[PDB]
Amino acid sequence: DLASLAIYSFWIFLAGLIYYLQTENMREGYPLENEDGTPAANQGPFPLPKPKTFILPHGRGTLTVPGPESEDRPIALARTAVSEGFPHAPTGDPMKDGVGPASWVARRDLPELDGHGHNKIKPMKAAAGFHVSAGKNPIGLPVRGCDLEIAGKVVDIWVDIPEQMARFLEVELKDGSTRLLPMQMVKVQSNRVHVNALSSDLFAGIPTIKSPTEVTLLEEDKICGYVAGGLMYAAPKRK
Amino acid sequence: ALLSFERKYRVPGGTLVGGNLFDFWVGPFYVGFFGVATFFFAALGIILIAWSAVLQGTWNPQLISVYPPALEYGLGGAPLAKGGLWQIITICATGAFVSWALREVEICRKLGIGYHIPFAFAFAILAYLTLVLFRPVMMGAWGYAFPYGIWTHLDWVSNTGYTYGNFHYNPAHMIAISFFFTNALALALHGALVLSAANPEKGKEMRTPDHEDTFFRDLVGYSIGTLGIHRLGLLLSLSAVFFSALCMIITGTIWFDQWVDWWQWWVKLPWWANIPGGING
Amino acid sequence: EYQNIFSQVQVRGPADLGMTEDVNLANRSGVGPFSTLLGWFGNAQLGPIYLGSLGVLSLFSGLMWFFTIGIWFWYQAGWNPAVFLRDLFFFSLEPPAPEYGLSFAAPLKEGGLWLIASFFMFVAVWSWWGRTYLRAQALGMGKHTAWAFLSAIWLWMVLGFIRPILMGSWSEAVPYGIFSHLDWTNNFSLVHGNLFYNPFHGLSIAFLYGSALLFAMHGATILAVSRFGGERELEQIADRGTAAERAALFWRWTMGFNATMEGIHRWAIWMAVLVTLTGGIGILLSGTVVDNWYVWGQNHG
Ligand code: BCL
Numbered sequence: 001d002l003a004s005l006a007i008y009s010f011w012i013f014l015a016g017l018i019y020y021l022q023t024e025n026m027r028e029g030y031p032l033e034n035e036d037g038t039p040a041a042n043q044g045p046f047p048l049p050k051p052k053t054f055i056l057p058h059g060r061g062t063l064t065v066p067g068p069e070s071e072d073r074p075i076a077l078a079r080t081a082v083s084e085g086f087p088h089a090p091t092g093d094p095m096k097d098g099v100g101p102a103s104w105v106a107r108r109d110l111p112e113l114d115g116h117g118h119n120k121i122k123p124m125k126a127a128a129g130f131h132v133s134a135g136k137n138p139i140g141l142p143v144r145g146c147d148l149e150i151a152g153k154v155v156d157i158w159v160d161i162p163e164q165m166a167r168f169l170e171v172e173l174k175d176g177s178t179r180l181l182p183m184q185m186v187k188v189q190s191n192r193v194h195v196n197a198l199s200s201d202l203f204a205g206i207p208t209i210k211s212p213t214e215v216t217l218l219e220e221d222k223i224c225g226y227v228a229g230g231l232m233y234a235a236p237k238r239k
Numbered sequence: 240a241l242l243s244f245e246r247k248y249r250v251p252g253g254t255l256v257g258g259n260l261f262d263f264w265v266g267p268f269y270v271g272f273f274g275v276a277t278f279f280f281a282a283l284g285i286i287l288i289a290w291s292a293v294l295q296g297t298w299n300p301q302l303i304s305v306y307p308p309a310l311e312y313g314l315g316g317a318p319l320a321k322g323g324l325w326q327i328i329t330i331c332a333t334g335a336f337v338s339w340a341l342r343e344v345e346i347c348r349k350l351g352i353g354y355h356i357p358f359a360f361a362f363a364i365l366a367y368l369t370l371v372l373f374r375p376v377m378m379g380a381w382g383y384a385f386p387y388g389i390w391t392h393l394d395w396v397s398n399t400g401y402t403y404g405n406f407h408y409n410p411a412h413m414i415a416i417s418f419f420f421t422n423a424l425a426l427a428l429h430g431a432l433v434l435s436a437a438n439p440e441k442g443k444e445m446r447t448p449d450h451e452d453t454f455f456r457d458l459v460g461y462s463i464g465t466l467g468i469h470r471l472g473l474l475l476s477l478s479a480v481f482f483s484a485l486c487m488i489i490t491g492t493i494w495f496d497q498w499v500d501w502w503q504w505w506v507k508l509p510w511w512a513n514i515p516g517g518i519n520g
Numbered sequence: 521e522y523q524n525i526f527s528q529v530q531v532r533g534p535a536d537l538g539m540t541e542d543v544n545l546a547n548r549s550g551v552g553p554f555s556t557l558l559g560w561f562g563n564a565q566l567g568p569i570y571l572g573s574l575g576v577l578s579l580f581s582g583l584m585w586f587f588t589i590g591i592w593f594w595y596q597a598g599w600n601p602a603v604f605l606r607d608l609f610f611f612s613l614e615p616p617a618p619e620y621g622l623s624f625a626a627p628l629k630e631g632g633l634w635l636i637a638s639f640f641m642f643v644a645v646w647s648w649w650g651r652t653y654l655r656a657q658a659l660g661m662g663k664h665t666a667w668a669f670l671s672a673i674w675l676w677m678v679l680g681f682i683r684p685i686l687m688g689s690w691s692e693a694v695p696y697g698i699f700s701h702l703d704w705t706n707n708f709s710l711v712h713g714n715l716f717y718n719p720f721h722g723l724s725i726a727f728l729y730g731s732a733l734l735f736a737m738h739g740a741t742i743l744a745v746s747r748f749g750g751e752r753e754l755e756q757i758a759d760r761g762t763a764a765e766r767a768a769l770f771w772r773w774t775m776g777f778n779a780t781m782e783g784i785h786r787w788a789i790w791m792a793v794l795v796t797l798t799g800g801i802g803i804l805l806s807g808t809v810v811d812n813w814y815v816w817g818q819n820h821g
Pocket residue numbers: 336363364365366367369370395396397398399400401405406407412415416419480482483484485486487705706
């Protein structure tokens with residue numbers, strides 16, 4: 001009868017949909033590899049999809065996925081065991097080397113552009129006429145680390161122009177140089193900005209940007225990576 | 240095996256318990272102490288269900304049903320054969336769910352991410368514990384809990400609902416349903432907006448967040464933003480489950496009459512109670 | 521530890537009139553106010569809105585639906601504002617009695633007014649559908665929003681138009697009223713021997729459920745990796761960052777498989793549309809093909 005045909009049809013459709021949905025989600029990270037980087041023997045029952053090509057705006061070319069995968073950076077790690085599935089110990093300072101929770105990805109060394117082709121993220125000093133409109137204005141506040149020591153002072157907010165939100169605080173250190181801190185990893189209080197992730201001595205180690213009015217996707221990943229790695233790797237100096 | 244980008248993230252540390260002892264992977268799966276805990280509670284729980292399916296005399300998945308103790312047993316233990324297996328399985332189920340959430344916290348700590356996922360999961364756990372623990376205990380019997388069976392658990396929903404008339408009239412149920420419906424609306428819109436921007440008209444360049452903001456202002460005069468829609472989905476879905484638990488915690492405890500009759504508080508207010516005409520006069 | 525559920529600081533700049541592409545800027549309004557309240561959770565900017573021909577048709581048509589119902593609710597209240605507010609949830613604009621079948625011949629006070637309101641709603645929703653297609657066409661974007669919206673329109677069409685026609689009377693349709701449409705829903709189940717035995721109702725629920733599961737998972741994940749600019753989903757698709765990687769790896773390590781930043785949005789749109797898709801089929805087959813879901817379920821056939 002018409003209902004049994006409909007429900008049997010649906011279950012077949014749903015199997016096709018799950019197959020399509022799963023192969024679509026294999027356009028990054030695949031094929032699977034052994035810990036040594038060689039291709040793994042058993043890849044599972046789902047094949048790689050046919051490549052698709054994204055046309056990037058503002059003449060930045062294309063991306064074709066799936067395509068050849070490479071880290072495009074050295075990985076300071078070493079095996080801790082003679083078989084698969086154990087942790088890989090850092091061979092240096094994991095914060096400096098950018099491994100574990102300090103990991104960054106070799107993204108394009110260009111800034112993200114708005115739809116008009118202008119830098120998405122500018123310091124507020126270079127964005128007419130952006131202002132703090134609500135909540136405590138952090139500019140001029142001392143920045144405290146998880147060791148409860150002052151590391152610097154806020155000297156600007158870096159703002160997403162198109163989405164009108166704060167993204168980083170620009171922080172001046174003892175030496176008069178500045179660093180970006182992600183907005184999502186600080187606590188703005190009445191009289192200070194508190195950073196749980198980092199101690200005062202680890203602020204100098206924050207990766208520096210190569211131009212004072214723009215930050216590239218690579219630099220964003222290095223900064224955000226480094227600061228998150230502090231939660232694990234600066235836990236000795238947290239109080 | 241590993242995703243191409245995975246090795247650099249497989250460092251030691253993050254564990255809450257047992258240091259480096261269970262700090263390893265089986266294929267894609269992170270283990271940890273709470274991995275072992277989850278396997279134990281789950282395996283024991285599955286054995287007890289198979290045992291329950293023996294004492295019941297059916298190996299059919301559409302028939303197997305573990306019932307709570309009968310109301311006469313109150314909040315005491317009961318023979319395995321009559322609701323004691325349900326009692327032990329319920330402990331095993333709570334053990335596996337809570338273990339699964341703490342395992343997610345270990346995975347968070349290793350990956351240096353926020354704890355938003357296990358926090359969200361704890362709301363699903365809270366709903367389960369409402370039906371099998373908090374409500375039964377408040378009502379004085381494990382019997383008011385739902386049985387573990389595919390169709391018998393549906394039977395319970397139907398009998399529990401119709402005990403208080405049409406359950407639609409529970410006002411906390413009304414609010415819970417509104418959040419469930421709105422969540423699905425918001426998930427459809429979100430999936431569709433990002434895909435319409437990444438997958439534009441043939442030949443054209445990828446759109447930008449700007450196009451996504453523009454599209455929604457053109458359509459309804461407001462765009463919540465790309466951070467806002469992720470905040471909104473978390474809030475709509477957690478709210479649905481909060482009000483779900485609330486609608487059932489108040490049912491058979493502070494309110495045990497017909498839900499439809501609760502609405503007379505509004506109709507019988509002094510200033511219009513006696514005015515003639517309408518549906519209620 | 522800061523959780524990113526609310527902004528700590530708001531920044532405002534010049535109002536954003538948006539991307540132009542092929543949009544007729546003549547039909548866009550100017551920006552409404554900024555809401556500082558809204559701005560703690562999302563964007564503070566209200567407006568601009570685009571209002572072309574279809575917008576005004578839909579908006580007028582949709583108000584005529586709402587007003588038609590309200591006129592009837594006032595009449596039922598004997599024009600007494602106390603009775604109106606007291607019985608607000610108890611009023612109901614009911615469809616024509618079975619006697620009049622599929623005829624447009626029923627009087628105002630016995631279903632004719634229901635048919636008027638319904639016509640206005642029919643024009644309101646379909647014009648609004650056309651608008652979701654066109655506003656995307658003008659920006660050069662995919663028609664995902666229009667195709668997703670069709671899934672919702674499907675269940676609505678089935679409840680009030682398609683199923684009433686196949687049954688052969690407007691009396692089968694849903695009445696306009698808060699408590700009355702709930703009774704209709706409860707009644708519908710009883711008359712068809714309990715929708716819980718309707719396998720499509722079962723799937724509809726699974727997907728409803730799954731929509732809450734998935735947006736809970738997704739929303740939580742993106743907030744958890746917002747410290748690496750995770751909410752910037754389009755640029756993470758074009759150039760995968762540590763946010764996309766830690767996101768994938770959390771889920772791989774938890775449950776054994778994972779998504780891409782783009783692929784999660786395909787899981788999302790499908791989980792959602794399948795709610796109203798399976799739903800509409802479940803209702804369409806009820807009383808047309810299956811009298812009793814309990815009985816049908818006993819033969820599985
Ligand atoms: C005749 C029936 C009555 C009715 C009687 C009831 C009764 C009785 C109840 C509801 C409840 C609900 N009703 Mg009602 N309800 C009716 C009609 C409706 C209608 C409708 C359109 O008519 C809708 C949309 C709803 C919607 C709802 C929801 C608000 C709510 C269920 C969600 C929930 O609690 O999730 C919460 C989620 C969970 C409990 C899941 C938790 C999952 C756990 C933590 C993990 C499990 C892991 C798993 C075992 C692992 C699997 C293995 C792996 C796959 C490998 N009802 C009618 C009028 N309704 C229920 C409620 O509010 O519960 C609190 C409830 O008890």
